[PDB]
Ligand binder design. Structure first.
Ligand SMILES: Nc1ncnc2c1ncn2[C@@H]1O[C@H](CSCC[C@H](N)C(=O)O)[C@@H](O)[C@H]1O
Length: 680
């Protein structure tokens, strides 16, 4: 009843075995205990009593001991239900046919000590293993109270396997210009893996064209994730049909396929080229519209399949996504779709970038939804948050990355910071322990934090109107960074081209700011060149409790040539008056917390330190860690955006490396984070 069975107390290997007491205190230990009718040995799985109304704990018994105080205790290490994880309440999720097994568990190494009184019963918890066959599993499972395939550690919300050259394809969704995608592909080389973005999906024409130009041999789809998927399913159907074992105007050839977005009759349409008509006369026609013509379709598909113009589940070996889910469910269906596509394609890995708020919004509804969906599919997962700066950028940009590695594959870690930028985690609650940093190990990365001067310093002077994509540097890269930022695709291994040089060798691209309508231009004209330039330096001025800007009587307004004033009324209103960023300029020793999609000086302190103009697109690209050889297209504003949205290339490029290691399975275990060997 109430107490310990008895037997040696094991002389002492007790201290040898577990001397945390022997300094929890132990008179001695036992290998068996008797509660009610029954005796529990060590290594027995058991149900334990939580607080009233709480679910019973589960445990593996580790310690049975006669602690001083004279009490009889046992310490078991804990077992985990998905609803006890970070993901509580999101067990209610289903993606496709995937649902959370109600009896399944994840094995922490987390232990606590209790009196034997709290032992309800003892449970059979069986351990699985990925490699098995129909019924090897089905047996076990059908014979057992519970099972565990993986350990859940809370450090990174990591669910991973527990025991008890080379090419991989990539799918970039919400690709934009492909900052993440490229960077990843660059790290892959360091790992020594050849990761190719065989597909990219984004619905913006311009982001798409940037991308394609910079990775010509990739299939760039400009459409929506929805359309893409549906298109994806139907295509599978076709491959079934045409591939092998049977499963007035004249259309000449079929150059394309889609599930029409604007074309929007929700049906497969095919691009049409017809005799006498240039590519400009082509049109999209519904599949049924097409006549019996096999040769056109049969050939189109067969030859497409050969070229893997489109993914099948078997072939995608990584996939990343940026799904915006701007903002239960309101829109955000975008994040949901991401997981729908993943669910379909079963990539060997998954990576997801998102703003930190995923975790803040309602207690990471979104974040826990992504995580939950991941695990529901039996996918090794973990997620942690990284700062762009730590990887050598003149900015502090914190975002969240979700690693989805398969059961059959290693789970990539996260790389530790390469720079000394000081990170004070907005480190929400549930996710407070998901972050990448050095706790207080003097990792030495003098890696003098980058500052603006270092980033844009070698920069031919340019003014408010510069309509030239490609100018010349007419200067040598003057800092370690800058010297690094302009490097041949060959030296950075962009590799997209065939071992031949890329276009735009040694050129300078997209160096040009947006044009301020003259009113604004003039306003920037009068901005001073001092360190702290703000509109405050301008005719009319203020002081007060607020620092609030109130016009300075005695001096009346002004007129631009147009007669508009210099100081718009809005500028005065901000924050009710803060030094603010209105028409503000930055120094070389300044950092941007984050590069923003939209550069207009009105509120953002975006104007070049010495030049009278807004930080040029390229200046932001460098700021975002873009190689100087990455070309951007479309209206200046549009590519300004393309850059704003992008995930920093150095960060993504470290990711690419850790991953790379993983795909080829070289790395330690159970360590949330890596450290990079050269400058990686
Ligand atoms: N409904 C949708 N369908 C397809 N793409 C969408 C979409 N809604 C948003 N997007 C994509 O979301 C992207 C913004 S985030 C893209 C950042 C990207 N990882 C990079 O830095 O390269 C946009 O490029 C847009 O193409």
């Amino acid at each position: 009843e109430p107490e310990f069975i008895g037997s040696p107390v094991a002389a002492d290997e007790a201290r040898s075995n577990w001397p945390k007491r022997y300094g929890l205190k132990a008179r001695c230990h036992y290998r068996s205990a008797k509660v009610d009718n029954v005796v529990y040995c060590l290594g027995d799985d058991v149900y334990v009593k939580a607080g009233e109304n709480e679910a019973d704990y589960i445990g593996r018994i580790t310690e049975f001991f006669e602690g001083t105080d004279q009490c009889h205790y046992f310490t078991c290490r804990w077992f985990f239900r998905a609803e006890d994880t970070v993901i509580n309440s999101l067990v209610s999720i289903s993606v496709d046919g995937h649902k959370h097994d109600p009896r399944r568990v994840f094995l922490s190494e987390e232990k606590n000590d209790n009196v034997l009184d709290c032992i309800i019963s003892k449970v059979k918890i069986v351990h699985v293993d990925p490699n098995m066959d129909p019924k090897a599993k089905a047996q076990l499972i059908e014979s057992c109270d519970l099972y565990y395939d993986m350990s859940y550690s809370v450090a990174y919300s990591t669910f991973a396997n527990i025991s008890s050259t080379r090419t991989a394809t990539l799918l970039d969704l919400y690709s934009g210009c492909g900052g993440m995608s490229t960077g990843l592909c660059l790290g892959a080389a360091l790992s020594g893996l050849k990761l190719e973005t065989r597909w990219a999906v984004d619905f913006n024409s311009f982001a798409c064209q940037s991308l394609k130009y910079n990775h010509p041999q990739t299939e760039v789809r400009n459409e929506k994730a929805d359309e893409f998927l549906a298109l994806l399913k139907e295509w599978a159907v076709l491959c079934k049909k045409y591939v092998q074992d049977v499963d007035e105007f004249v259309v000449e050839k079929l150059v394309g396929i889609c599930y029409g977005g604007s074309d929007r009759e929700n049906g497969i349409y095919f691009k049409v080229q017809w005799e006498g008509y240039g590519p400009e006369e082509d049109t999209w026609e519904p599949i049924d519209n097409l006549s019996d013509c096999p040769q056109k379709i049969r050939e189109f598909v067969q030859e497409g399949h050969k070229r893997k113009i489109l993914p099948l589940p078997g072939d995608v070996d990584v996939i990343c996504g940026g799904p915006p889910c701007q903002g239960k469910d309101e829109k955000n269906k975008q994040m949901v779709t991401f997981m729908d596509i993943v669910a379909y394609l079963k990539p060997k890995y998954v990576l997801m970038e998102n703003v930190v708020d995923i975790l803040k919004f309602a207690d990471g509804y979104l974040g826990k939804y992504a995580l939950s969906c991941l695990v529901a599919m039996k996918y090794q997962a973990r997620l942690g948050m990284m700062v762009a700066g730590c990887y050598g950028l003149p900015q502090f940009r914190m975002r969240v990355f979700l690693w989805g590695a398969l059961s059959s594959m290693v789970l990539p870690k996260y790389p530790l910071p390469t720079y000394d930028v000081v990170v004070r985690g907005g480190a929400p609650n549930a996710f407070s322990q998901c972050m990448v940093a050095y706790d207080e190990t003097q990792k030495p990365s003098l890696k003098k934090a980058l500052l603006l001067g270092d980033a844009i310093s070698d920069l031919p002077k340019v003014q408010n109107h510069q309509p030239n994509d490609v100018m010349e540097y007419g200067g040598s890269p003057k800092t370690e960074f800058q010297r690094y930022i302009r490097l041949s695709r060959k030296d950075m291994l962009d590799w997209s081209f065939g071992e031949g040089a890329g276009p735009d060798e040694g050129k300078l691209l997209d160096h040009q700011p947006l044009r301020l309508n003259n009113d604004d231009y003039e306003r920037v004209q009068q901005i001073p060149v001092k360190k702290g330039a703000n509109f405050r330096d301008l005719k009319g001025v203020r002081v007060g409790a607020n620092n609030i800007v109130e016009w300075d009587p005695e001096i009346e307004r002004v007129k631009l040539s147009s007669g508009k004033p210099l100081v718009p009324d809005y500028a005065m209103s901000f924050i009710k008056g803060k030094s603010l960023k209105p028409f503000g300029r930055l120094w070389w020793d300044e950092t941007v917390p984050t590069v923003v999609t939209r550069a207009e000086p009105h509120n953002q302190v975006i104007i070049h330190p010495t030049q009278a103009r807004v930080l040029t697109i390229r200046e932001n690209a460098r700021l975002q860690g873009f190689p100087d050889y990455y070309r951007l297209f479309g209206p200046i504003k549009e590519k300004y955006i393309q850059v704003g949205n992008a995930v920093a290339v150095p960060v993504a490029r470290a990711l690419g490396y850790c991953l790379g290691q993983a795909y080829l399975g070289e790395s330690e275990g159970s360590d949330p984070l890596y450290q990079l060997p050269p400058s990686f």
